[PDB]
Tab-separated table of C-alpha atoms and ligand atoms in Angstrom:
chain	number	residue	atom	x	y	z
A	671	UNK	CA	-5.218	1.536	-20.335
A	672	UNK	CA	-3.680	-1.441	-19.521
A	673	UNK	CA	-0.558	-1.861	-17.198
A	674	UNK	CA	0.059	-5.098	-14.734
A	675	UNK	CA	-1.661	-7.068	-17.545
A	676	UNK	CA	1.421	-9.711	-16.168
A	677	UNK	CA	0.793	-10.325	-12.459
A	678	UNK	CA	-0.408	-13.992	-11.964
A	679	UNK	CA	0.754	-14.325	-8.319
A	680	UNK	CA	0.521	-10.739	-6.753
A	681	UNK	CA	-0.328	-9.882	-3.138
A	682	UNK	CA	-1.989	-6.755	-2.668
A	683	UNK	CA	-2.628	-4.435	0.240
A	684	UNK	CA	-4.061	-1.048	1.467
A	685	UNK	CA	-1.937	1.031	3.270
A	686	UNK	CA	-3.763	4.396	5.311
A	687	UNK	CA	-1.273	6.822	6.599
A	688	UNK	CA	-2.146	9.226	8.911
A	689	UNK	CA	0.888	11.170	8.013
A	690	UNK	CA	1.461	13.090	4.177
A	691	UNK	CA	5.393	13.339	5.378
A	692	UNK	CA	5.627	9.866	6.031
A	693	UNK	CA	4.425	9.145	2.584
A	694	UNK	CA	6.930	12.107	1.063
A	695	UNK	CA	9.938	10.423	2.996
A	696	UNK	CA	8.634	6.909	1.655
A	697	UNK	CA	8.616	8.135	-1.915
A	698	UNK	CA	12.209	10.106	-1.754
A	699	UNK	CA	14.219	7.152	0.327
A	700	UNK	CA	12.111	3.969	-0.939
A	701	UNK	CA	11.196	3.056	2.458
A	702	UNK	CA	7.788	2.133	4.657
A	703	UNK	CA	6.621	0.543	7.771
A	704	UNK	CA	3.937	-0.531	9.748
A	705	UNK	CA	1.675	-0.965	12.710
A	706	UNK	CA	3.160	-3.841	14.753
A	707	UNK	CA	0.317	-5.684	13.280
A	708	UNK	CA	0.584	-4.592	9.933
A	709	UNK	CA	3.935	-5.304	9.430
A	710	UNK	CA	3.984	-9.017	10.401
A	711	UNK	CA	1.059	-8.866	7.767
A	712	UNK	CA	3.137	-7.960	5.374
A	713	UNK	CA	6.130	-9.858	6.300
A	714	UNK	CA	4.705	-13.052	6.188
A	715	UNK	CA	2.693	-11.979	2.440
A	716	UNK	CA	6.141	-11.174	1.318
A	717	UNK	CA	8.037	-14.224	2.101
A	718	UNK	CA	5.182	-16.537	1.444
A	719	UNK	CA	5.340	-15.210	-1.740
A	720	UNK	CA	9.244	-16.369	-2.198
A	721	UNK	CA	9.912	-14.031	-5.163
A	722	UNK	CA	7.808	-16.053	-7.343
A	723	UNK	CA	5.053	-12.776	-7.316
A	724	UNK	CA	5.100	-8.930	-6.521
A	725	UNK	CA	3.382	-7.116	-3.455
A	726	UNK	CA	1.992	-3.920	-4.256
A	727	UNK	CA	0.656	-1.065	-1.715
A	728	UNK	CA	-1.921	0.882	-2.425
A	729	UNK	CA	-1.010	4.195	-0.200
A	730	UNK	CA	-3.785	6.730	0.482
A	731	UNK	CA	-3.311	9.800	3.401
A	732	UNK	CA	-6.618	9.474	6.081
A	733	UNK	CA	-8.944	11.724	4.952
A	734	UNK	CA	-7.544	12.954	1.677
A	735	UNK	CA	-10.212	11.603	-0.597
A	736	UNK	CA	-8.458	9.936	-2.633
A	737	UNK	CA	-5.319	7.523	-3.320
A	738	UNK	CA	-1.748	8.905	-3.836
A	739	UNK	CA	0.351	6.365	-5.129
A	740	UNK	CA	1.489	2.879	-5.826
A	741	UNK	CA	4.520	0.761	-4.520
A	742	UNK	CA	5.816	-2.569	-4.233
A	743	UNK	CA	7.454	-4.224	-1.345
A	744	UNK	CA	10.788	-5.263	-2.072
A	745	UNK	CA	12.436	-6.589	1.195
A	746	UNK	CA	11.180	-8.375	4.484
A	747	UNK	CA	10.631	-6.518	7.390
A	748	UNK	CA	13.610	-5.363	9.464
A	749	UNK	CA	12.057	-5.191	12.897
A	750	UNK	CA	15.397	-3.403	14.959
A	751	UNK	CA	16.215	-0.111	13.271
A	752	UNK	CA	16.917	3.212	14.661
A	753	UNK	CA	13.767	4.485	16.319
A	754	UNK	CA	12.281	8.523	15.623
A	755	UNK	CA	12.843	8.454	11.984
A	756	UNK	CA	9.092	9.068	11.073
A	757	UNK	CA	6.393	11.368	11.990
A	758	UNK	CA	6.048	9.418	15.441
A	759	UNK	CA	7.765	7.524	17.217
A	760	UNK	CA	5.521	4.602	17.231
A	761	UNK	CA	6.591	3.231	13.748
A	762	UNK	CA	8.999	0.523	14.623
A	763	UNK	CA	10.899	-1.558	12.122
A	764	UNK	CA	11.481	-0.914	8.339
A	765	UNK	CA	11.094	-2.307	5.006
A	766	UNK	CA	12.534	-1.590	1.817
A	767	UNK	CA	9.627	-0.536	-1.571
A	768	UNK	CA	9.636	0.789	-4.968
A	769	UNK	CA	7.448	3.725	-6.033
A	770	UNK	CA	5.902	2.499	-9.361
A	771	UNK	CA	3.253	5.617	-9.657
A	772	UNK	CA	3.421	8.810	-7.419
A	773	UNK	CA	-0.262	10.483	-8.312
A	774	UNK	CA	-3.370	11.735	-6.613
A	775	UNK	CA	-6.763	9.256	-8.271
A	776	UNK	CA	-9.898	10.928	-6.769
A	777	UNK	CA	-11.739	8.076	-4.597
A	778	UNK	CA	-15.024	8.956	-7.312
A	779	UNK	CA	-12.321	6.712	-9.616
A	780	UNK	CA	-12.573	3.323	-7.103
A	781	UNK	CA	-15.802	3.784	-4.396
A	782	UNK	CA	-17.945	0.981	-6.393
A	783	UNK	CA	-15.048	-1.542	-6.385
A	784	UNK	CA	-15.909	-3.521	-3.430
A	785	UNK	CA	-13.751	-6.073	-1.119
A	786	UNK	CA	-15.899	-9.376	-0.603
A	787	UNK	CA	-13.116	-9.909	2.101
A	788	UNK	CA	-14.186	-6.869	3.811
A	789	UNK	CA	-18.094	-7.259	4.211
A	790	UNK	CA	-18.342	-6.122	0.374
A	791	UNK	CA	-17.533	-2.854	1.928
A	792	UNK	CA	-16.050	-0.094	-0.987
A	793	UNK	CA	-12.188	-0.799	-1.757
A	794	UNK	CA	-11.961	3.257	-0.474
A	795	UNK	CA	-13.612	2.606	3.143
A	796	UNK	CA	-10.323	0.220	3.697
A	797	UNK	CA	-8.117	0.305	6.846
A	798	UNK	CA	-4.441	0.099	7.283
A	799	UNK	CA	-2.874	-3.293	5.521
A	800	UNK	CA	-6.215	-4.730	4.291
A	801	UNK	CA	-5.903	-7.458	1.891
A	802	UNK	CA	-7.175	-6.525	-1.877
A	803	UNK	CA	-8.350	-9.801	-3.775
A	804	UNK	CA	-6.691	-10.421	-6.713
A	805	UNK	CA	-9.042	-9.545	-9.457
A	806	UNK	CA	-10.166	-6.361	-7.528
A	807	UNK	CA	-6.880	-5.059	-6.855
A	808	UNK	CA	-6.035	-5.402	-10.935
A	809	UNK	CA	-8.939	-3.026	-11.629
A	810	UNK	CA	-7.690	-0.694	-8.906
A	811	UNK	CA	-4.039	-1.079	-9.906
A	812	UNK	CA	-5.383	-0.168	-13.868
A	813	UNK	CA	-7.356	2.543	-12.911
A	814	UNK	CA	-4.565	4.506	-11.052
A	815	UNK	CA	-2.358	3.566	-13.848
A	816	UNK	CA	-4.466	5.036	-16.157
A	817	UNK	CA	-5.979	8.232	-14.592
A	818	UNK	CA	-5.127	11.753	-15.698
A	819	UNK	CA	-5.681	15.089	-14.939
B	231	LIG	C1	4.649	5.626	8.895
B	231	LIG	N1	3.287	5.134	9.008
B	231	LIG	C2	3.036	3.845	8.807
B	231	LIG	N2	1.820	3.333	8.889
B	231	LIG	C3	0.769	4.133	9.197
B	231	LIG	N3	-0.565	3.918	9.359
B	231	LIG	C4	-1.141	5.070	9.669
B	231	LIG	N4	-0.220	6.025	9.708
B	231	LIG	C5	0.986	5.468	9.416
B	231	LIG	C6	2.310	5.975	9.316
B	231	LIG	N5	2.598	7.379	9.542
């Protein structure tokens, strides 16, 4: 029922992959990256932050109905790395995360959570790196926490 009961500072994003194997190779080497776009996003959310709070990804595969997992970022972004080491080679850079939960929470579980950043538009009609607010991102953090089969 209730996990991240103790995150006063967090940062919290959507990330949309349009790849499953990107996600697998995240989860096995602890490992993500971005859009160009998306990963200054997240670079400047994590060192803002200073240590002093966690960033957590909410990862969902385009047109799966439903999230897959939860991770936090644990490392700026490292924009010169070896290039080809993802589905395509347009992922540029790298960043180091943890896995926290590895499941599949039907979107039915989060469409009436809405974003009032995002046009009050359903937390599962997000794009790639969207900012969650706070107190809607705990509710969607709990409920993935919480579901079962
Ligand atoms: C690796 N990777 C990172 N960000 C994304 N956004 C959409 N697809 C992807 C992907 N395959």
């Amino acid at each position: 029922n209730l996990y991240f009961q103790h995150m006063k500072h967090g940062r919290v994003f959507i990330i949309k992959s349009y790849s499953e194997d990107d996600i697998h190779r995240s989860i096995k080497y602890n490992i993500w990256c971005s859009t160009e776009h998306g990963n200054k996003r997240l670079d400047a959310a994590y060192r803002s932050m200073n240590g002093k709070g966690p960033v957590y990804l909410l990862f969902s595969v385009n047109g799966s109905g439903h999230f897959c997992g939860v991770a936090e970022m644990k490392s700026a972004v490292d924009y010169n790395t070896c290039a080809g080491v993802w589905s395509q080679d347009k992922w540029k850079g790298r960043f180091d995360v943890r896995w926290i939960f590895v499941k599949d929470v039907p979107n039915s579980q989060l469409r009436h959570i809405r974003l009032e950043n995002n046009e009050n538009k359903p937390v599962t009609n997000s794009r790639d790196t969207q900012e969650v607010p706070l107190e809607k991102a705990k509710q969607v953090l709990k409920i993935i926490a919480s579901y079962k089969h």
